[PDB]
Structures are given as C-alpha cells and as structure tokens.
C-alpha cells in the first residue's frame, strides 16, 4: 500500500497516473481519499474529473469543483481506479492536491 | 462496471436511464455517487428527484436541491436504482451533473 | 422493499408511520435515507424527531433541525425504525420531506 | 437496544452515563449517533468531550464544538463507549442534545 | 485499544507518534477519528499532514486544513498509520487537537 499525492494546477491541467509495473504483480488499483486546495489556488470553480476510455472515446467524470468561497475541499469516498488514469481540470487554475494510496489487492480465490 | 454521467438542465428537466440489454445478462442496477452544479447553473433551488412507479402512479423521490449560495453539491450515499429510471427537476434550470456506475451484480447463490 | 415518502409541516406536526400488515409476514422495518426542505418551508429551525415508547412514556429523539440559512438538508445514516413510528416537529412550520424504504428483512436463521 | 438521550448545558457541564446493571447481563456499551444544539443554546463554541480514565487520570476526548454560526450539529460515527462514561463541556453554555443507544452485544463465541 | 489525543500548535508544528513497545506484541497501528480546533487557534489555514518515509525521503500527506471561518473541524475516516508517525503543520499556529486510538490487531491467521 504505497502512499500517493499529486496536484492539478494551471500547468498541470492534465495529470497521468501510472503505477510501476512491479506492483502489477499483485493486482493493483488506486484508492483515493482526500482533495484539498493549493496555496496558489484562486477564487474560482476548479472542476476535477477522473478520465478513462469509454466506447473508445475519452470519457471524463466530473468528481469535484473546488472553490475557496463555497467548498475548497473534498473527501473521496469509495473511489478506486485502474491505472493508467487521467485527472483533468476542465476549468480552474489550481493547485488542487489529490491524496490516495497505490493499493494492491492480494490474491483471493475464495 | 461501466461508468455513467448525465446532466439535468432546463432542456433536460426529465432524463431517462436505460442500460443496454447486454448488461442485463448479469443482474444489473445503477449506483450513484456524486452530483455537482453545471457551468450554466443559476442561483436558485434545483430539486432533483429519482422517479419510478409506485401504486401504478408516477412516484418521485426528492434526492437533492442544489443552489450555489447554499450547497451546490451532493454526495449520493447508498443509492442503487433499477433501470429504467427517471431523473427529474421539479424546479431549477440546471445543468446538474449526475455521476454513477452501471453496476452488474454477479451471480451469488450463497 | 417498498418506497416511502412523507412530509412534516405545520398541518402535519405529527405524522404516523404504519406499514400494512401484509408486509409484516417477512419481518419488517423502515429504513430512512434523506430529508429535504419543502417548497413552502420558512427560514426557521425545524426540529424533526423520531418518537416511540420508552419507560411507558412518549420518548422523542431529535434527529434533525432544518433551516434554509444554515442547512436545509439531512442524509439519514443507519436509521431503522419499528412500525408504528411517530415523526414530530417540536418547532417549525415545514414542509420537510422524509424519504425512506419499507424494508422487510428475509428469514435468516444462520 | 434501549434508546438514550441527554443534554449538556451550563447546569449540566458534566454528565454521567451509567446503564442499569440488568443490561450488564449481555455485555453492554453505548453507541452514539447524533448531537444537536438546544433551544437555549448561545452563539459560542461548545466543546463536548467524552471522558474516561487513562493512566489513572481523568482523560478527556474533545468530540465536537457546536456553534450556531459555524456548525451547530454533529453526526457521531463509530463511537462506542464503556459505561460509566463522562460527557463534558470545557466551554459553552448549552444545551447540546446527545442521542444514542444503550446497545448490548449478544454472546458471540465464533 | 488505548485512547490517544495530541495537539499540533505553533510550538508543536511537528509531533512524533510512537506507541510503547509492549503494545507491539499484538500487531499495532493507530486509527484516527476526529480533529478539532484549539482554544488558542487563530483565523487562518492550518494544514495538518501525516508524514512517513517514501522513496527514502520525507513524504508528507496533507490531511486537513482547519480554519474557523471555513471549517474548523475534520472527521478522519479510514485513516490507519504505522508508528512511528509524524504529524506536521506546513502553515498555521494551532492548536489543533487530534483524537484517535492505539489499536492492536489481534492474531488472525484465517
């Protein structure tokens, strides 16, 4: 269970998540828990999406929209992703810090 | 586990959820997690309901009422629906983005 | 699993929940999920209680206090009641919409 | 599963929880769910603690700090206490209503 | 299951968690539940992180950012740490009270 953190900002409107192939030995995903505003964040709506492929096209999932004047935080409940993953901001300058865990589910044939 | 997203707006006061019949092979429902305001949303109360049939009549379930000045967001906990489903706005212009998963429960005779 | 909704207002300061005796065949309770402000709700504190009998007297349990200016909503987590049940407003004009399910636990002798 | 409610106020800065010895037959604790402001509550920070003995000294656990202007409510998740218990206000006038259940875990030797 | 509480303040920008070696007999971690503002807390952003070693370097995990004017509280869900642990404030004067349990998982070879 590795510990992971990243940031989505105006230089990082698109971020790519890819765990190292070694952890792919025990079948691996990414579990996400918290998202918080950065120190350079502006007072606007910051729309973070989780992005993968659906129907062969780039599918985006609006997860949160952080704003200092409404709610600059998010607690990510039950969100588990298959690497590679994309994190996007369709609007906003950031930074928005993403915190999660590189989780590797153990062999379970029960 | 397909990934689903839609929007309820003033052109989409009523939205119809129907998964493709193929996923009906392994018995299927829709699990919902998050709802967020759209970029064209206005500052008013936006009442989203989940709608099915009860007693033979159209039964609505007020789920959320999003408003930028009070709470423009909702985290949908433990909400699982049987397709076809209806999503309604009894008031509001939208858009309000709905995010969930096409979940298909596996055969479990335990 | 029947779907249930009611409203506590100034004409409905006390509401009585009683499921039909047929669902009493498979042992039955009421599970509650969400509560939202009504369209005629005023800007005041609306104190909803779940009421049953304790020590032989009318026992009330303050569950929520909805107000448009503080928090007009509630997400009811882990609340399961034995019918008949009473829902009360010790203050407020309403309406406050209550959403839940008539749940009937199946025979489980494990 | 008895139903319990109390209030911490300026006359009740310290409250003592003690279930009757009869329920001690089946091994008993107290599970807490919700806390709400009283009707006589003032606009200040009301710091409620759960208090027991640690290292032989009076140990307090700040659980919540209710205030009408910030957040007058709390939903107590996963809080289970061994009677006798103390509930304290290190600041505030109250009342603050505490709601929970006298829970008695059944014999389970599995 | 020992009960633990600490505070991160301007004299305690860095706090070290280390359980006594005796509890290391039954394999031990720290489970965290609540965080609340101190009585001497100021109106600023107080960024608490959980810190351990990753890639051989000091890795920090922004957990919360408490502020009286936005949200002075946090409910820590599903957070379990391996002692020794570090708790940091990258900004803020504190105090910020951390509440948790010294939990020791029992032998389970199932």
Minimal C-alpha gap between A98 and chain B (Å): 17
CA distance C28 to D21: 31
Query: In which region does residue E56 sit, left (phi positive, over 0), alpha (psi from -120 to 50) or beta (all else)?
Result: left
Which one of D32, D57, D58, D65 would you mutate to disrupt binding with E, by most E Cβ within 10 Å of its Cβ? D65
Closest CB to B59 among C3, C72, C75:
C3
Q: What is the C-alpha separation between A2 and A25, in angstroms, rounded?
A: 14
Q: Does the beta-carbon distance from E73 to D78 stay under 8 Å?
A: no
Instruction: Tell me whether D73 touches chain E (CB under 8 Å).
Output: no
Q: What b-and-e string marks burial along C56-85, b requiring 16 or more CB atoms within 10 Å of the CB?
A: eeebbbbbbbbbbebbbbbbbeeeebebeb
- Pseudo-torsion of CA B21, B25, B31, B35, nearest 10°? -20
**What is the three-class DSSP state of D25?**
helix
This PDB structure is determined at a resolution in Å of 5.2
Query: Cα separation of C88 and E86, whole Å?
Result: 48
Asked if D47 and D89 count as a contact pair (C-beta separation under 8 A), the reply is yes
Contact C89, C2 (CB under 8 A): no
D40 phi and psi angles, rounded to 5 deg = -100, 10
Assigned token pair, E4 = 């633990």
Cβ atoms D66, D72 nearer than 8 A: yes
Cα E68-E47-A97 angle, rounded to 5 deg: 115
Question: What are the tokens at C32?
Answer: 């509650």
- Please tell me the distance in Å from A61's CA to the nearest CA on chain B: 7
Tell me, letter by letter, the H, E, C secondary structure of chain C: CEEEEEEECCCCCEEEECCCHHHHHCCEEEEEEEEEECCCCCCCCEEEEEEEEECCEEEEEEEEEEECCCECEEEEEEEEECCCEEEEEEECCCCEEEEEEEEECCCCCC
Those residues whose C-beta lies under 8 Å from the C-beta of residue E109, and which sit 6 or more positions away, are none
Q: CB–CB of B71 and C73 under 8 A?
A: yes
In whole angstroms, how far apart are CA D33 and each of A69, C69, C78, D61?
30, 24, 9, 16
* Shortest Cα–Cα distance, B58 to chain A (Å): 30
Torsion angle, alpha carbons of A104, A106, B2, B3, to 10: -30
Which DSSP state fits D13? S
Distance between CA A27 and CA A5 in Å, rounded? Answer: 20
For chain A positions 4-43, those within 8 Å of chain B (CB to CB) are none
| Residue written as token pair 């300026």 | D10
Q: How far, in Å, CA of E106 to CA of E110, rounded?
A: 12
C-alpha to C-alpha distance for D88 and B41, rounded to whole angstroms: 45
Which residues of chain E are within 8 Å of residue A2 when distances are taken between CB atoms?
54
In this structure, what are the phi and psi dihedrals at residue E36, rounded to the nearest 5 degrees? Answer: -140, 155
Count Cβ neighbours within 10 Å for each residue of B59-92 and write b for 16 or more, e otherwise. bbbbbbbbbbebbbbbbbeeeebebebbbbbeeb
Which of B10, B15, B13, B9 shows the shortest CA–CA distance to B100? Answer: B15
- Name the residue facing B62 among C71, C75, C99 (closest C-beta): C99
Q: What are residue D44's phi and psi, to 5 degrees?
A: -150, 175
Q: D39: helix, coil or strand?
A: coil
For domain B2-104, give the fold: Jelly Rolls (2.60.120)
């Amino acid at each position: 269970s590795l510990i992971w953190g990243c940031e989505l900002n105006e230089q990082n409107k698109t971020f790519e998540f890819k765990v190292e192939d070694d952890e792919e030995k025990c079948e691996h995903q990414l579990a996400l828990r918290t998202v918080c505003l950065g120190d350079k964040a502006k007072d606007e709506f910051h729309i973070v999406e989780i992005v993968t492929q659906e129907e062969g096209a780039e599918k985006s999932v609006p997860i949160a929209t952080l704003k200092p004047s409404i709610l600059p935080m998010a607690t990510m409940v039950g969100i588990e992703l298959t690497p590679p993953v994309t994190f996007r901001l369709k609007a906003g300058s950031g930074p928005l810090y993403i915190s999660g865990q590189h989780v590797a589910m153990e062999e379970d044939y029960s």
